[PDB]
Amino acid sequence: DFEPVAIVGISGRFPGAMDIDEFWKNLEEGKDSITEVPKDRWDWREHYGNPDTDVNKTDIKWGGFIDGVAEFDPLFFGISPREADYVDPQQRLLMTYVWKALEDAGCSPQSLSGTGTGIFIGTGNTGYKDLFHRANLPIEGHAATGHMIPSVGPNRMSYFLNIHGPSEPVETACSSSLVAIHRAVTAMQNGDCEMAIAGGVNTILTEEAHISYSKAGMLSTDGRCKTFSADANGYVRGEGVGMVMLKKLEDAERDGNHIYGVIRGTAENHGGRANTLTSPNPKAQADLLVRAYRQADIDPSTVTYIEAHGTGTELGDPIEINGLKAAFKELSNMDVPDHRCGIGSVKSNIGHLELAAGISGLIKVLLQMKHKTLVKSLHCETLNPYLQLTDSPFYIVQEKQEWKSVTDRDGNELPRRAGISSFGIGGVNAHIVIEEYMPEQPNVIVLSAKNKSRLIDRASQLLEVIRNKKYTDQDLHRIAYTLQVGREEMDERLACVAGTMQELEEKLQAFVDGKEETDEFFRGQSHRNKETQTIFTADEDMALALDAWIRKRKYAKLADLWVKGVSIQWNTLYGETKPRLISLPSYPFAKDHYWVP
Amino acid sequence: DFEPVAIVGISGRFPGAMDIDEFWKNLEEGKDSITEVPKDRWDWREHYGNPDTDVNKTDIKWGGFIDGVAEFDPLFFGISPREADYVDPQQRLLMTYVWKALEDAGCSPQSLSGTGTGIFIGTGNTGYKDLFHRANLPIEGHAATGHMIPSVGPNRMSYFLNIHGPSEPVETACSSSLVAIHRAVTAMQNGDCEMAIAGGVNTILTEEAHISYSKAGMLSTDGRCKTFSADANGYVRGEGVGMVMLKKLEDAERDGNHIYGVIRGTAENHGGRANTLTSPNPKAQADLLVRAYRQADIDPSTVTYIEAHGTGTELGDPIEINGLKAAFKELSNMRDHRCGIGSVKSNIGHLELAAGISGLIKVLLQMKHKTLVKSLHCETLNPYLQLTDSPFYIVQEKQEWKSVTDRDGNELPRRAGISSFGIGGVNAHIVIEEYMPQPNVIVLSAKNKSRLIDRASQLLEVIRNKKYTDQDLHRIAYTLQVGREEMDERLACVAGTMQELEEKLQAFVDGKEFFRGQSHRNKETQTIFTADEDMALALDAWIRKRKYAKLADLWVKGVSIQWNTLYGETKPRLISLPSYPFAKDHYWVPA
């Protein structure tokens, strides 16, 4: 009954990592991105002290922090600069990264308008409203949808995108963004929606939670998640945002999406009565895993990596290992002899992103699949003696290594299979099972943006990515098609004709360098040529001429019309078999500052 | 493919209404429960002014408020009095009312332990943390799970009850508690759980939202939801809490549950791009409804009441009517209908997180009593409703809720719908159908003597106001025997009529023919009587010989009696009885 769900687009920003590319670079190099708290959030020295004896003090001076928490492009999203000050950074990052995941997928907003697409995002209050009260700012009407009601974040994006599926904040603490994946997939099975965006956003805006969580005994006095280590003594807090776009696998394959991985099963439960309210329950976790792998109907011996919840608490890590061991044993009781499974945790790299913890874990795994590499889990040179992995399928990933394929009883290599766990301190558990996805002539390369500065930015992004050779000449039509049908058509336009990445690169540089134009690329503004658009759209004879130009591949001519805002049916440029959509740079939003006024 | 879900237990507290009984009394009488803001919340005069011109001021001095917002019995839930101060009233009310909904159903905690039961509750921050942040109270470790993370409310109850199903806060603004029902019903269909508890909790603890929402243009300057009226000009804020226990209809019938009504379909959607972010979308509401009723596979002409979202906005009320008309028209097309419409907000205000659950409970009671109650303040209808050429009329006066009959001459179960729409655009709709169906030992227990006396008075009072007959006696007995946790302070009496029961209860309450004991003080007797096969035979013989006074005597001393064996294969049906009378101790922000 369960229909597999494709992951067709992703986006994110993490401690030390501006985007998904840098994130992988950091993970591959074993980089630790935890820092001391930045002065622009609060002064850690001012609140420093012994949390067990000193009023409102903490010894926790560390966190994983992201750049740009206050950056937003409100006009892009139809919000005024004045309104923007009132809008919670939780919402602003939500809107920004949802759009980026859509652009990553190559899914145009026009394609999404009117659909039952769902949105499920781990989000909640993180102190923006408190920053208002501290500055003794008056209470205004804007505050209500701006920063008083967390559901407004997802709801504002559904409004903007004109989509009709469920639109919800998800808050189950540490497990939120993985429960959101569960809820999204579940929604896709029962017809609540057809496609969904899911993810999480976590921001650390005041010292209050550091202080309170410090006093509750949750945080490491060394400021590191030393997951699996004998020295594990709490977690370190982090900020971040991650988003995935989800489509039924059938649809994704049919529509030509690119596919990061396939969700084969999910589960959510609660730990029930544990030792204390905040103690994880190894029996609940085992049962969770069992449910997920039964749904996926995959053999436990083919699962070769697990992204643990792995917060680096002294008691939690072994409990998690014990849950895994019980689960795999029960599943074995009811394919690949010598079962070996790596275990690691992105928390060791960027800390515990709380609301965005689960999505950060899924993205690490997707990248690990893309690059057939298991990256190093940090700070665990000396393993916690309670793990006892020797007589089991499991090992901790203590060094970067190839993620090797496994092969069935017959001769054929199997897709890499992995699981991701996320557990909330209140007892809400989630697990997700992922499987690796197993798959001249000129064209018109088009770009558009809201204004000239953003258009130059888009050009640079594309330029930079061609130069660091992420693409080759075999990709050119995939690039062209994605840009043609997989991007919103905005007002400021650039088009050039190219048959090679080199020819493309050259024309892009020309537009970027200057100026520097001599009729080699095309430029226009949609709003400045109306009545020509009407002519080519509401007149049957001009439409037929336009169709002929496309069929005859008059590229230079079509480019000239497109930059002027004339609607071109690019599909007619291709046979029945369309080029597969491809991951390209997403919108370079203005980095404008909005904060408490 | 859709499996119908039974509502088998309910609980709640609303403005002007301490419990469900009083809530119905208020509704039947057409009572308006909105008042001025109580001084113990804030002083409205202090924040009074013109919201359009005056900084930090509002002209909104009304709300629907409940009693006991600060009241909690923490030792019941294994929480210390000291920790209790840090626990958000959102969570305290959640725990309190989830337990009452379980007891209403006649479901013992022992029965739930280890099960995959879910909890889905509309809840969120409502200012408790802000009351700390103001009085510059020190930040403590207790604050983290106490009032910083709203998911801890449902999670703490899953912990307490030892249940393993999904446990979640639901926050979609105004639609939250109805979306919670959708999510629970959906979870029960896909195996995320077997049974579920769903509901909503809304508390109004500071003036901040009154001020912001006032300035946003959301609130009536008269302080009333005048839903459907020509004077409709915004809503009035209310507090409240309501809970339902949900079981698959198959299971409920099989297990002998009593059933308030049956959910035949649900739906949730988003309005997408509307005129503004906060504008409702009649086309989205129409598609919502169409989906719910298609799922329910019921003919539209059999639906005879709709509980509208009905906030009493000038533009929203007609928009809702237009969505309804379009939906039913579309439903007729893919195949003398008369359908009433009302809104409980006219009675108690907009309960926000608990608005949806309030509307459902009104409908359940309307069903119980075969009555459509008056929707208030709508003597003069909004001229934009345009109801004349349609099945709909506004319920402007109390009236019988009449059955309608099919073509084969047969009576139909009453069918109703409930809508709840969030200001961010999240819509939910739920379709409900009316459910069509010698002595014993009466036992009571509580955590202490005071709570036991409370339980006895509750039972006395409900017998005196004639809620039961002699025909119910074995249902009462059975429910109390198997549908209540066995707590330490115990009372039992033998009775063959309500009269005799009433007499014996009055005797115990007065201070005076009944049995009384404490389980923890009779480990000696428990030793004598426990874990032996010949003792078992003896107990089986006492039951067979109906030696009730003797069994009652042992039971109050903490001996296990197999009460099930007093009955044949078909047990009496569980019945709704008063739920635990929690201690009304005050817990709040610490000095």
Residue in chain A nearest B119 by alpha carbon? A270
- B189 contacts: CB under 8 Å, gap ≥ 6: A190, B2, B3
Q: What CA–CA distance (Å, rounded) separates B432 from B5?
A: 10
- Locate tokens 């009671």: which residue? B365
Q: Tell me if residue A202 falls in helix, strand or coil.
A: strand
Residue A358 near residue A122 (C-beta atoms within 8 A):
yes
Would the CB atoms of B156 and A426 count as touching at under 8 Å? yes
Count of pairs with CB atoms under 8 A, one residue in A, one in B: 220
- B547 contacts: CB under 8 Å, gap ≥ 6: none
Q: What CA–CA distance (Å, rounded) separates A373 from A353?
A: 23
Shortest distance between the Cα of B141 and any Cα of chain A, in A, equals 4
- Please name the member of B165, B190, B425 whose beta carbon is closest to the beta carbon of A270: B165
- A170 contacts: CB under 8 Å, gap ≥ 6: A120, A121, A122, A123, A176, A177, A179, A180, A183, B168
User: B454, B489, B460, B452: which is closest to B476 by C-alpha?
Assistant: B460
Query: Which amino acid makes up residue B375?
Result: S
- B358 contacts: CB under 8 Å, gap ≥ 6: B12, B14, B177, B200, B240, B242, B344, B348, B351
Strands A401-402 and A413-414: unpaired
Query: Which amino acid makes up residue B526?
Result: Q
B66-82 b/e (C-beta count within 10 Å ≥ 16 → b): beebbbbbbebbebeee
Q: What DSSP assignment string belongs to A63-127?
A: EB--S-TTEE-GGGGT--HHHHTTS-HHHHHHHHHHHHHHHHHT--HHHHTTS--EEEEE----S
Residue B213 near residue B39 (C-beta atoms within 8 A):
no
- A28 contacts: CB under 8 Å, gap ≥ 6: A371, A373, A375, A400
**Annotated active-site residue in B147, B350, B429, B474:** B350
Q: Tell me if residue A587 falls in helix, strand or coil.
A: coil
Q: What CA–CA distance (Å, rounded) separates B466 from B488?
A: 29
Q: Tell me if residue B63 falls in helix, strand or coil.
A: strand
Q: B494 - beta bridge partners?
A: B441
Q: What CA–CA distance (Å, rounded) separates B282 from B277?
A: 14
The CA-atom distances, in angstroms, between B542 and each of B476, B546, B554, B566 are 21, 6, 11, 10
Positions of A marked active-site? 174, 309, 352
Half-sphere exposure of B19 (CA within 13 A, CB side): 14
**Annotated active-site residue in B174, B339, B378, B493:** B174
- A33 contacts: CB under 8 Å, gap ≥ 6: A14, A15, A16, A17, A26, A64, A349, A350, A351
Q: What is the DSSP letter of A175?
A: T
3-state SS of B495-548 is ECCHHHHHHHHHHHHHCCCCEEEEHHHCHHHHHHHCCCHHHHHHHHHHHHCCCH
User: Which residue intervals of A217-334 are DSSP H helices?
Assistant: 249-255, 282-296, 316-332
Query: Which amino acid makes up residue A450?
Result: K
- Tokens read off for A507: 């024309």
User: B244, B87, B154: which is closest to A270 by C-alpha?
Assistant: B154
The CATH-assigned architecture of domain B1-474+570-591 is: 3-Layer(aba) Sandwich (3.40)
User: A7, A64, A16, A24: which is closest to A374 by C-alpha?
Assistant: A24
Count of Cβ atoms closer than 10 Å to residue A452 Cβ? 13
Residue B157 near residue B113 (C-beta atoms within 8 A):
no
Q: What angle do CA B392, B393, B399 make, to 5 degrees?
A: 125
Q: What CA–CA distance (Å, rounded) separates B123 from B127?
A: 12
Would the CB atoms of A270 and B114 count as touching at under 8 Å? no
Helix, strand and coil in chain B, % to nearest 5: 40, 20, 40
Sign of the torsion formed by the C-alpha atoms of A134, A135, A138 and A143: negative
The CA-atom distances, in angstroms, between A102 and each of A109, B99, B517 are 8, 44, 67
* Length of chain A in terms of residues written: 597
- Tokens read off for B584: 């009304």
- Locate tokens 């209860």: which residue? B505
Q: What CA–CA distance (Å, rounded) separates B230 from A160?
A: 32
Would the CB atoms of B277 and A156 count as touching at under 8 Å? yes
- Locate tokens 């915004």: which residue? B234
CATH number for the domain formed by residue range(s) B475-569: 1.10.1240.100
Residue A554 burial class via C-beta count within 10 angstroms: exposed 0-12, middle 13-18, buried 19 and up: middle
- B281 contacts: CB under 8 Å, gap ≥ 6: B271, B272, B274, B319, B425
Count of Cβ atoms closer than 10 Å to residue A545 Cβ? 10
3-state SS of A207-224 is CHHHHHHHHHCCECCCCC
B258: annotated active-site residue = no
Sign of the torsion formed by the C-alpha atoms of A347, A349, A353 and A358: negative
Please give the radius of gyration of chain B, using alpha carbons only, rounded to the nearest integer: 25
Cis amide bond preceding A515, omega within 30: yes
The CA-atom distances, in angstroms, between A406 and each of A290, A337, A393 are 21, 10, 14
Would the CB atoms of A142 and B213 count as touching at under 8 Å? no
Q: Tell me if residue A17 falls in helix, strand or coil.
A: strand
User: B559, B140, B95, B173: which is closest to B351 by C-alpha?
Assistant: B173
Q: What CA–CA distance (Å, rounded) separates B425 from A595?
A: 26
Q: What CA–CA distance (Å, rounded) separates B315 from A86?
A: 26
End-to-end Cα distance, chain B: 56
End-to-end Cα distance, chain A: 52
Would the CB atoms of A145 and B179 count as touching at under 8 Å? no
User: B14, B346, B65: which is closest to B205 by C-alpha?
Assistant: B65
Residue B353 near residue B122 (C-beta atoms within 8 A):
yes
Half-sphere exposure of A483 (CA within 13 A, CB side): 24
User: A129, A308, A286, A175: which is closest to B169 by C-alpha?
Assistant: A175
* Length of chain B in terms of residues written: 591
- Tokens read off for B120: 């889905």
Residue B533 burial class via C-beta count within 10 angstroms: exposed 0-12, middle 13-18, buried 19 and up: exposed
Q: What is the DSSP letter of A580?
A: P
Domain A478-576 coded CATH 1.20.1050.10: no
Strands (E) in B451-509, as ranges, are 489-495
Q: What CA–CA distance (Å, rounded) separates A47 from A38?
A: 13
Q: Among 3.30.1200.10, 3.40.47.10, 2.60.40.10, 3.30.565.10, what is the CATH number of A1-477+577-597?
A: 3.40.47.10
Residue B458 near residue B578 (C-beta atoms within 8 A):
yes
Q: What CA–CA distance (Å, rounded) separates A377 from A393?
A: 18
Q: What CA–CA distance (Å, rounded) separates B508 from B511?
A: 5
φ/ψ of residue A12, rounded to 5: 175, 160
Sign of the torsion formed by the C-alpha atoms of B154, B160, B163 and B164: positive
Q: What DSSP assignment string belongs to B144-206?
A: IIIII-TTHHHHHHHHHHT--S-EEEE-BTBTHHHHHHHHHHHHHHTTS-SEEEEEEEE---S
Q: What CA–CA distance (Å, rounded) separates B196 from B184?
A: 6
Q: Tell me if residue B224 falls in helix, strand or coil.
A: coil
- Locate tokens 């649809």: which residue? A251
Residue B184 burial class via C-beta count within 10 angstroms: exposed 0-12, middle 13-18, buried 19 and up: buried
Q: What CA–CA distance (Å, rounded) separates A78 from A74?
A: 6
Half-sphere exposure of B552 (CA within 13 A, CB side): 20
- Tokens read off for A318: 């072994």
Residue A245 near residue A104 (C-beta atoms within 8 A):
yes
φ/ψ of residue A234, rounded to 5: 125, 175
Would the CB atoms of A151 and B211 count as touching at under 8 Å? no
- Tokens read off for A246: 């989800």
- Please name the member of A113, A158, A272 whose beta carbon is closest to the beta carbon of B164: A272
The CA-atom distances, in angstroms, between B175 and each of A79, B11, B90, B121, B268 are 25, 19, 17, 12, 9
Would the CB atoms of B277 and A168 count as touching at under 8 Å? no
Helix (H) or strand (E) holding B253: helix B249-255
- Please name the member of B56, B171, B212 whose beta carbon is closest to the beta carbon of A141: B212
Q: What CA–CA distance (Å, rounded) separates A271 from B162?
A: 8
With contacts defined as CB-CB under 8 Å, which chain A residues touch B281? none
Residue in chain A nearest B134 by alpha carbon? A133
Q: What CA–CA distance (Å, rounded) separates B102 from B128?
A: 27
Q: What CA–CA distance (Å, rounded) separates A107 from B104?
A: 50
Count of Cβ atoms closer than 10 Å to residue A244 Cβ? 29
Q: Tell me if residue B264 falls in helix, strand or coil.
A: strand
Q: Tell me if residue A525 falls in helix, strand or coil.
A: strand
Would the CB atoms of B152 and A426 count as touching at under 8 Å? yes
Shortest distance between the Cα of B67 and any Cα of chain A, in A, equals 25
List the domain boundaries for chain B: 1-474+570-591, 475-569
Please give the radius of gyration of chain A, using alpha carbons only, rounded to the nearest integer: 25
Q: What DSSP assignment string belongs to B374-408?
A: PPTT-SSB-TTS--TTSSEEE--S-EE----B-TT
- Please name the member of A144, A271, A284 whose beta carbon is closest to the beta carbon of B212: A144
Q: What CA–CA distance (Å, rounded) separates A57 from A207?
A: 10
User: A250, A263, A253, A126: which is closest to A183 by C-alpha?
Assistant: A263
3-state SS of A47-80 is HECCCCCCCCCECCCEEECCCCCCEECHHHHCCC
Q: What DSSP assignment string belongs to B16-28?
A: TBSSHHHHHHHHH
φ/ψ of residue B206, rounded to 5: -135, 175
Query: In a mutagenesis test of the A interface, which of B2, B54, B129, B139 is the best target, namely the one with the most A β-carbons within 10 Å?
Result: B139
- Tokens read off for B38: 């109580």
Residue B209 near residue A147 (C-beta atoms within 8 A):
no
Residue B344 near residue B358 (C-beta atoms within 8 A):
yes
Q: Tell me if residue A337 falls in helix, strand or coil.
A: coil
User: A351, A365, A350, A430: which is closest to A173 by C-alpha?
Assistant: A430
Helix, strand and coil in chain A, % to nearest 5: 40, 20, 40
Sign of the torsion formed by the C-alpha atoms of A27, A31, A36 and A38: negative
Q: What CA–CA distance (Å, rounded) separates A188 from A225?
A: 34
Deposited experimental method:
X-ray
Q: What angle do CA B107, B109, B115 make, to 5 degrees?
A: 95
